């Protein structure tokens, strides 16, 4: 039942959401980052200054060595193998999954994040060292009767700050959202790639060729904190946001996501910052639906501007997902969005999912 899966995610603001998992026999308990932006099950497997726990292969009676190393600059190095894996507050099953045992790394783990590994939930095409290394979720579906679908409700903090959420594996929990679920097609099965057809700041269209929004791609990534936008789109966005909040301005170190901005105890002028609407391509070619996010989402806790520039396409990260219940419907190659039961909002504005909006070529081919 999904009830036992509710609130199975925890984390620190800006450091990602993790789920408890066990690996090996007897079960070794570890906290694992839920990451829709990668496809490896990679776990710390050797002492590290930021790790308080790590996977000890020699303690597992069920560990099997694949006699194959892996080098991943992007960095971390490790040895490939397989072992039994379970999610205590997920489905009641045990699967034999590939595991990359990380023996050395640089700038990979985060101090105080309280996770020791990453659960890459994306597709095999982007798995390291290649696509023959079956990702965890693929193993899970193939080995069990679990439906090929999972959903994420990231809730952030609300009033480093602690965050919480739910990962529901194998179905949709209706208690986690209100209103309608709107679906955007998964363009290609590598990252969770989608297509943005329009974006507006306070109802004002940025008026860009929609290819700009997906240059060179747009992905949904729980493993990225910020909403990351292509250079040209980012500049247009900041300008519009700056203008809307012109009433008393801020340092540019803030707009660059460097410096923080501070008011005190519920004096934050949310109403000065505009809402941002991302229109996603619908299941019907000429249709779209918009997800609308509040300053409560893109200003993350004093606050930091959680929108930043990208040279690798648009990334709809945690701060975007935190407004919504997000359904990764792998079985039907689509991603669903609905207003989250947990999202933060004031008494004048709320996050929204609304459609359809019809138009009269937005993908950046590959
Ligand atoms: C964008 N991104 C990362 O850089 C990564 C990552 C990079 C390379 C990987 O190994 C490969 F390449 F083999 F897949 C696997 C995953 C990542 C790595 C470490 C992190 F602390 C975070 C992170 C940091 N703060 C908040 N939340 C997540 C993200 N996860 C995502 N989505």
From Swiss-Prot:
Segments on the Extracellular side according to the record's topology features: 1-366
Active-site residues, as the UniProt record annotates them: 35, 221
Modifications made to the protein after synthesis: N-Glycosylated. Addition of a bisecting N-acetylglucosamine by MGAT3 blocks lysosomal targeting, further degradation and is required for maintaining stability under stress conditions. Acetylated in the endoplasmic reticulum at Lys-68, Lys-207, Lys-211, Lys-217, Lys-231, Lys-232 and Lys-239. Acetylation by NAT8 and NAT8B is transient and deacetylation probably occurs in the Golgi. Acetylation regulates the maturation, the transport to the plasma membrane, the stability and the expression of the protein.
Annotated Peptidase A1 domain residues: 17-338
Summary of activators and inhibitors of this protein: Inhibited by RTN3 and RTN4.
Any one Gene Ontology cellular component term annotated for this protein: plasma membrane
Key words of the record: Acetylation, Aspartyl protease, Cell membrane, Cell projection, Cytoplasmic vesicle, Disulfide bond, Endoplasmic reticulum, Endosome, Glycoprotein, Golgi apparatus, Hydrolase, Isopeptide bond, Lipoprotein, Lysosome, Membrane, Palmitate, Phosphoprotein, Protease, Signal, Transmembrane, Transmembrane helix, Ubl conjugation, Zymogen
Glycosylation sites recorded in the entry for this protein: 92, 111, 286
Recorded consequence of changing residue 35 to N: Decreases beta-cleaved soluble APP production
Disulphide connectivity of cysteines: 155-342, 210-362, 262-302
Tissue distribution of the protein: Expressed at high levels in the brain and pancreas. In the brain, expression is highest in the substantia nigra, locus coruleus and medulla oblongata.
UniProt KW Endoplasmic reticulum keyword: yes
Topology within the bilayer: Single-pass type I membrane protein
Functional note: Responsible for the proteolytic processing of the amyloid precursor protein (APP). Cleaves at the N-terminus of the A-beta peptide sequence, between residues 671 and 672 of APP, leads to the generation and extracellular release of beta-cleaved soluble APP, and a corresponding cell-associated C-terminal fragment which is later released by gamma-secretase. Cleaves CHL1.
Free-text note on domains in this protein's UniProt record: DXXLL motif is required for a proper endocytosis and retrograde transport to the trans-Golgi network, as well as for regulation of lysosomal degradation.
Protein name: Beta-secretase 1
Species in which this protein is naturally found: Homo sapiens (Human)
